[PDB]
């Protein structure tokens, strides 16, 4: 039940993959709040290139809106919409 | 086409998710060799817990074997099996 080399290479090559990104990375300005969930499933550029000199970088970007629970202590809590950046296309470019 | 809060919470909560893991930090002792691909798709514990103060950690683990190209420069190329650890079940445990 070994995973075939070409399937391994195709699954690992620089492409957008579901990444769990912390919300504090995307909205650091929102300090007073605690979020639920604290992180979000976003399509983010991941994987390797044919050579070590190259890095997997985003080319096409877009936004997705998501219901997220805002909690400010001594205030209460509500669910608002929040827009998050996602990577649609990826490229292997030299390290600058 | 907004993503409903319950779907967001279910997709984000501490569970094993396909992660692209670098081979060089799983087999550091093998310095002389260059690998293709240089990283591998492994099920690894990821996501958040109900409170920051808990961390998402593996409980049940296994190995998956994968065909990987081993290259020692000026010597030649070979495809061998390589065994990698992967996470089957996850838990939210205190730090």
């Amino acid at each position: 039940e070994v995973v075939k080399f070409m399937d391994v290479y195709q699954q690992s090559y620089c492409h957008p993959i579901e990444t769990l990104v912390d919300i504090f990375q995307e909205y650091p300005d929102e300090i007073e709040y605690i979020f639920k969930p604290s992180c979000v499933p976003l399509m983010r550029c991941g994987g390797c290139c044919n050579d070590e000199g190259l890095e997997c970088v985003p080319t096409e970007e877009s936004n997705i809106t998501m219901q997220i629970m805002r909690i400010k202590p001594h205030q209460g809590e509500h669910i608002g919409e929040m827009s998050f950046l996602q990577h649609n296309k990826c490229e292997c470019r030299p390290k600058a | 086409e907004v993503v409903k809060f319950m779907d967001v919470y279910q997709r984000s909560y501490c569970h094993p998710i396909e992660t692209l893991v670098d081979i060089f930090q799983e087999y550091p002792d093998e310095i002389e060799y260059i690998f293709k691909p240089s990283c591998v798709p492994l099920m690894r514990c990821g996501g958040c817990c109900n409170d920051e103060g808990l961390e998402c950690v593996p409980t049940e683990e296994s190995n998956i074997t994968m065909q990987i190209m081993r290259i020692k420069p000026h010597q030649g190329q070979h495809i061998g099996e390589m065994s990698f650890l992967q996470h089957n079940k996850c838990e939210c445990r205190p730090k």
Binding site: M69 | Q10, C49, D51, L54
Partner: peptide
Amino acid sequence: CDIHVLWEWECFX
């Protein structure tokens, strides 16, 4: 329900 376990709306109540 428990903090260490995942999910039901009436926890988020």
